[PDB]
């Protein structure tokens, strides 16, 4: 996260990092619980990715150094990626992890709402992107979990940041006309999280941008209302 702040243990016990095991254990990127044994992602985090068995989730975490080899963490036996997901500039940037066991709720963990149909029409006006990415274009994993309230843009509004790209109804922007405050390299996977009628929503997932925190240069996110049949489909079959 740029020019954000440090986040209080508990703030958002819906994000989670997701580590990888292969070569050496390293946070990969963000998610959000979104069921007991659902984990909301982004689909391009897997793209070294050949198998499950090298991920590890950590839910309840404030601070990467409260991970070390005793800490428990989530097993992934399923990694779901949109079928039509080709690359995070290209939309479709979704993907569900089936976790091994169920995630007991509590203070420290526990689920976010999907957004509703009828709240496709809803104006967010609280929205947060949290993480433990880059602060600056060139730094390290943060150790403590960062937020900053980063105000929601039209897609008109960033279609003309983006020429060259096609900003589709499915992605969402979100950025200050200055920049300043923004997603960066490590925050990819994780939650836009609106609070509305005192309940947070999950509005997006950190996807891409044309770096970090740059003016007129807005993150880009995939807009999860469009994918929540897709998200039923997969978490509710049979
Ligand atoms: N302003 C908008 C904003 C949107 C989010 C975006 C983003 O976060 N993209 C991801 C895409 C990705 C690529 C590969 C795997 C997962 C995700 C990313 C992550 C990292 C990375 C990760 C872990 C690290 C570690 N452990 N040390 N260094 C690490 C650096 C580097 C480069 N890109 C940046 C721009």
Redesign the pocket.
């Known amino acids: 996260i ?1 020019g954000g702040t440090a986040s209080v243990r508990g703030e958002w016990p819906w994000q989670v990092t997701l580590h990888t095991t292969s070569p050496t254990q ?4 963000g998610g959000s619980i979104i069921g007991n044994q659902w984990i909301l992602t ?1 689909a ?5 990715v050949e198998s499950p068995k090298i991920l590890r989730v950590y839910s309840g975490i404030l601070n990467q150094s409260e991970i070390k080899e005793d800490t428990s963490f989530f097993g992934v036996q399923e990694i779901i990626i949109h079928d039509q997901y080709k690359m ?1 500039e290209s939309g479709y940037d979704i993907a569900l992890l089936k976790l091994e066991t169920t995630v007991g709720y509590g203070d420290s963990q526990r689920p976010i709402c999907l957004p509703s149909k009828g709240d496709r029409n809803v104006i967010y006006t609280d929205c947060w992107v949290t ?1 433990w ?2 602060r600056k274009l060139r730094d ?2 943060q150790n403590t979990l960062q937020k900053a309230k980063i105000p929601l843009v039209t897609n008109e509004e960033c279609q003309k940041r983006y020429r060259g790209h096609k900003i589709t109804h499915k992605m969402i922007c979100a ?1 200050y006309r200055e920049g300043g405050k ?8 994780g939650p836009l999280s609106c609070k509305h009628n005192e309940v947070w929503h999950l509005v997006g997932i ?9 003016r007129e ?5 995939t807009n999860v209302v469009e994918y929540v049949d897709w998200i039923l489909e997969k978490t509710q079959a049979v």
Do not use: M, N
């Open positions: 740029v390293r946070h990969l990127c982004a391009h985090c897997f793209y070294g995070a993480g990415g880059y390290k994993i950025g923004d997603a960066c390299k490590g925050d990819s996977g950190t996807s891409w941008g044309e770096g970090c925190a740059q240069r807005p993150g880009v996110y």
